[PDB]
Design a binder for this molecule. Structure first.
Ligand SMILES: Cc1cc2nc3c(=O)[nH]c(=O)nc-3n(C[C@H](O)[C@H](O)[C@H](O)COP(=O)(O)OP(=O)(O)OC[C@H]3O[C@@H](n4cnc5c(N)ncnc54)[C@H](O)[C@@H]3O)c2cc1C
Ligand SMILES: Cc1cc2nc3c(=O)[nH]c(=O)nc-3n(C[C@H](O)[C@H](O)[C@H](O)COP(=O)(O)OP(=O)(O)OC[C@H]3O[C@@H](n4cnc5c(N)ncnc54)[C@H](O)[C@@H]3O)c2cc1C
Ligand SMILES: N[C@@H](CCC(=O)N[C@@H](CSSC[C@H](NC(=O)CC[C@H](N)C(=O)O)C(=O)NCC(=O)O)C(=O)NCC(=O)O)C(=O)O
Ligand SMILES: N[C@@H](CCC(=O)N[C@@H](CSSC[C@H](NC(=O)CC[C@H](N)C(=O)O)C(=O)NCC(=O)O)C(=O)NCC(=O)O)C(=O)O
Lengths: 461, 461
């Protein structure tokens, strides 16, 4: 058994930051990674996705070519070309991440970690034992897929992982899910050409976001060639000699269920959820508590119930974002190694952008949550809806919706929600201002930047 | 002589806002406008310019087409097509502005106002006299042009106004100036195809912005096909049977002056400065004080030396931006009509974006100004320089530079400066945060939005 000061299991987003931060503080760390470093984000998440998004966004502006006085280009997107580059990039970030670890004197124990029956928390990677006074579990999660028992033929569909393994643009796509991933896949596949259908159990997507986003996003989706099959469920899936045959049930409230076949399907993508990578860690060896779905139960300080063990990131099941895993890994290192006893991540006012078309940006409370936190009498909301001047000369259109939620009589901005061009880069500042406890006056007392879509947020009346 | 409660001379940006704000407060107002309403911004500024910018930005992304797996389109931008649309839009905003005035019960006295020799401040528009207990001078400015006496042949060049009257894309362009306008024209003409040369008296452009912006902007300009002729001056201009012949002197410090001819010039654009529209107001009739260059001298509250007369906007010569004219017109109405005795515009931390390629965003103090305000010992600056992941797969490249200036030991962000993709929409939030008196911790305690260029600002180390 070899001792370190920190043994972080998982070379992902939260994993690495905590490892790096720890080393700066003089700690002797090592990171265990069983696959490629950089975790999900870099290999099958933020990075590969965003390249595909910039590409889909490219397909759109090309449509607007003639309106801007330019001749037209046919199209016929070559997926292979871009898949090759996307991959190259991803493999260049790998070398980089590895470099930085070794530059920081952080060992990388390549393999699969599992806890042992040894009294003090000790882990075993390929026969060898390693322990540390502080161990972090940053194993993240995996895409979930239905069971053949529930949906016979489920194994025939792919997931976001599989999406990143795709070599050519599928002619017909059906996506099952109504969250940001589902939406983003729907957006990219449809912009690049696949005849996309998004299949949701309800009438809207992103049903957890402010109602405006939920509503607008379902709209923009439809208005862009994506077919939204509301109130539908895949009953079973079959492999025909031409494609896949999705047998789905559609039960619109007030109507009788209608069974339907969607044939000639090239791709069936499962964007229904994420499961934790906890199973094979042998948590039961130490009695490390988890929930019914396998996530790892932690406190305000990422502590497990076992002294010396913490967990951060997707594995915990909360605020599943790279910057959140990162931020919590960062604060932990400062708590354990810098002794900042109250170093912890504030999970309120975490900003998030969905890369739909146009992009969604949001931070803070929804109207509902403000209503149920402060009371109707105390919640004011300001909003606007305009078409960006980019579409002043184009026949193709998209809107921009902005909503400001304000609490109490001072008008403390407790939440911002918006959708439209520039909203992806436009959100950070407001998240900082919002984090500071900005009121509607602070926003309204800032000189506008004209012409921008961002000036609308500071002139809401 | 007909009485109103407010008589605002000038249907521009500052003019209108003050008129509208006044009406909401129950005041009897009227606006005098001698031309099209909406002033400079709408007719020959923000609006027309920005359409041309979105168009130039379109030319660029088209270059990146093949890298994103799309076939290539030749090009051959048709200027007429877009000029027609840009104009249509501008004429649709006119109807709109007019509408809103009448909806607010604001009269529009169409014509040219001039003060009279009548004891109490009274103005005369086309024979008729009008007075008010409060009169606002929102007459803005005009593009300046050299005198034939100084630069013989100067009258042969056009200005930004003339640029908006252009019907076809000039084959060869030479721009004289090193400010945001000069730069923006250089950017658009060059992206759309003209063989552009930007002529500056020094080695860099935007010499008033933080040194980083000054430096980076001169670079990006060159790297995009714009020829920067540093240390050069147009000596005289001549109309040949093929184009114009710019005779210019180039005096690089340490070298002997070299006289040069630039022939076959289709366009000579004068972006050397703005002059105030004060001459014909007959200010001398009341002794309304002005400076040597004709701007109108005002105090913290936009007051002239004459009781009952104020001035806001470009006419004053300070912070020449639409949102600034607007913001000051707004505060004045609230002061005069809502009685907010201390309602005035704070001219510190006014945000500004230059629409260069990529866009520049800035707010606050430059390093120099922080250095000379706090002292070297008390100024820390953080910065980064990265290539946006949009260029991860493109052969064409651009950077992104970010600089944070921090004062004292708390690290109060007194200034932010940046250049690159998304910086135009990315700036508003930080301007609000900066306005609030945000420190580097508030920025650093905000959860990042990945992947974006904006996340870089909140992770500067
Ligand atoms: C499609 C798709 C797009 C996404 N897009 C975005 C986006 O734009 N922005 C965003 O913020 N988030 C996005 N996410 C979410 C983000 O990727 C995750 O929230 C984030 O990576 C979580 O970090 P983590 O540190 O817990 O784990 P992870 O980064 O997932 O990585 C865990 C690492 O641990 C390794 N490991 C697992 N178990 C063990 C073990 N027993 N021993 C050793 N090795 C092991 C894993 O192999 C992996 O490399 C996306 C996710 C998917 C899927
Ligand atoms: C190229 C170009 C691009 C620009 N781009 C931007 C940009 O992207 N963003 C930005 O913020 N700013 C930009 N500006 C600056 C902005 O346009 C001006 O700062 C702003 O319009 C100033 O407002 P104002 O209220 O003082 O006057 P103005 O809006 O200029 O208008 C004054 C009005 O008064 C009328 N008038 C004049 N004298 C009289 C008189 N005696 N009686 C009656 N009528 C009269 C004028 O005709 C005019 O319509 C740009 C300017 C130019 C030129
Ligand atoms: N923000 C720009 C920068 C370009 C970019 O993608 N840069 C990164 C890829 S981000 S993909 C990986 C991801 N991000 C980061 O490493 C940097 C992003 C930001 N500083 C943040 O902390 O959120 C992550 O998993 N980090 C682990 C950790 O630090 O804990 C890279 O080149 N980095 C190499 C380097 O570090 O020099 C963009 O997104 O376009
Ligand atoms: N911000 C979006 C909105 C689209 C847009 O251009 N909208 C404006 C043109 S801004 S061009 C004219 C300019 N801007 C405004 O009227 C609105 C911009 C913002 N609210 C601000 O106050 O800075 C101005 O001179 N205002 C005088 C004043 O209010 O004092 C328009 O349609 N307005 C019609 C309307 O008012 O409904 C964008 O720029 O793309």
């Amino acid at each position: 058994v070899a001792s370190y000061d920190y043994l972080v299991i998982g070379g992902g987003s939260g994993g690495l930051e905590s490892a790096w931060r720890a080393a700066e503080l003089g700690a002797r760390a090592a990171v265990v990674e069983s696959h490629k470093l950089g975790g999900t984000c870099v290999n099958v998440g933020c990075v590969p996705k965003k390249v595909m998004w910039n590409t889909a966004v490219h397909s759109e502006f090309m449509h607007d070519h003639a309106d801007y006085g330019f001749p037209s280009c046919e199209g016929k997107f070559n997926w292979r070309v871009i898949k090759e580059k996307r991959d190259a990039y991803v493999s260049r970030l790998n070398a980089i991440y590895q470099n930085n670890l070794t530059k920081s004197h952080i060992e990388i124990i390549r393999g699969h970690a599992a806890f042992t029956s040894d009294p003090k928390p000790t882990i075993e990677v390929s026969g060898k034992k390693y322990t540390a006074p502080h161990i972090l579990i940053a194993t993240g999660g995996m895409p979930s897929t239905p069971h053949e028992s529930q949906i016979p033929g489920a194994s025939l569909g792919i997931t976001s992982d599989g999406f990143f393994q795709l070599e050519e643009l599928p002619g017909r796509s059906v996506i099952v899910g109504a969250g940001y991933i589902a939406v983003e896949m729907a957006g990219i596949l449809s912009a690049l050409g696949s005849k996309t259908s998004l299949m949701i159990r309800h009438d809207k997507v992103l049903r957890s976001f402010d109602s405006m986003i939920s509503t607008n996003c379902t709209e923009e989706l439809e208005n862009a060639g994506v077919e939204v099959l509301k109130f539908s469920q895949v009953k079973e899936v079959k492999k025909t000699l031409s494609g896949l045959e999705v047998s789905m049930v559609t039960a619109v409230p007030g109507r009788l269920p209608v069974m339907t076949m969607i044939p000639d399907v090239d791709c069936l993508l499962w964007a229904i959820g994420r499961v934790p990578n906890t199973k094979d860690l042998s948590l039961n060896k130490l009695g490390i508590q988890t929930d019914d779905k396998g996530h790892i139960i932690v406190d305000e300080f990422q502590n497990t119930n076992v002294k010396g063990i913490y967990a951060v990131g997707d594995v915990c099941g909360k605020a599943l974002l790279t910057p959140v895993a990162i931020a919590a890994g960062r604060k932990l290192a400062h708590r354990l190694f810098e002794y900042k006893e109250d170093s912890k991540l504030d999970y309120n006012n975490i900003p998030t952008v969905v890369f739909s078309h146009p992009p969604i940006g949001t931070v803070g409370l929804t109207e509902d949550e403000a209503i149920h936190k402060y009371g109707i009498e105390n919640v004011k909301t300001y909003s606007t809806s305009f078409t960006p001047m980019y579409h002043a000369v184009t026949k193709r259109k998209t809107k921009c919706v902005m909503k400001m939620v304000c609490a109490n009589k001072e008008e403390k901005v407790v939440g911002i929600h918006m959708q439209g061009l520039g909203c992806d880069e436009m959100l950070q500042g407001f998240a900082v201002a919002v984090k500071m406890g900005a009121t509607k006056a602070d926003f309204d007392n800032t000189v506008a930047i004209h012409p921008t879509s961002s000036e609308e947020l500071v002139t809401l009346r």
